[PDB]
Symmetry: C2
Subunit: 130 residues, 2 copies
């Protein structure tokens, strides 16, 4: 049986494959998925459907080549912390960015129940300035 | 000596909250790499306790009224430790306040803190700095 760490790693693998079905496979209906306040997709999403539509779809619509690259994955038992880099080109302005990000995850009884994003919202915002 | 990385980082946070810089820096390694996020006003990688005090904490005290970190969670990943909480403060030049989230990723080796990295809502901090 998978540890929380493996469950989260599986999510990141599915993200590398651009596979939203696999990305959401272990998301519990109790999920609270928080995009950072200053991030364009800011908010707390409470179903896999809301996450796909209001976060991943929106990113695909508004950015070219929006990418996350995982650098580290820290095992805190039921909590797992991913660290990496985002990059992308904002379609309206044609401006790119790259910045750091950390994600804090929690798993409960084999399902992901919590996600929170911590990223350089200023650097992302700069790409979105005319 | 038998103190875990988690405890060492908890000790740091306690010292920082009560503004005891000697205790704040007591376990900082000679080989420290302390990274303030690129979009944060104190952005950069600092490589000694002296640098960190002068170019991070001193500057925060000079440029902000009541700059505060409130620890909400502390996650024990062994040699790595992740703090999560909230920043708040009032930028002295504009009189504007902010509050936002932050995560800190720490690494301890042989009883000393060797890496710190900050991940915070740099846009919200920046908004407070706008005339």
């Amino acid at each position: 049986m998978r540890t929380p760490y493996q469950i989260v790693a599986d999510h990141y693998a599915a993200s590398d494959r651009h596979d939203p079905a696999a990305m959401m496979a272990d998301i519990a209906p109790a999920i609270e998925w928080t995009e950072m306040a200053g991030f364009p997709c800011a908010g707390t999403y409470r179903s896999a459907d809301e996450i796909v539509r209001n976060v991943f779809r929106r990113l695909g619509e508004e950015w070219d080549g929006y990418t996350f690259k995982l650098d580290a994955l820290h095992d805190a038992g039921d909590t797992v912390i991913g660290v990496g880099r985002y990059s992308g080109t904002y379609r309206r302005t044609g401006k790119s960015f790259e910045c750091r990000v950390a994600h804090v995850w929690r798993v409960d009884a084999g399902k992901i129940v919590h996600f929170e994003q911590f990223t350089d919202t200023l650097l992302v915002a700069q790409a979105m300035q005319p």
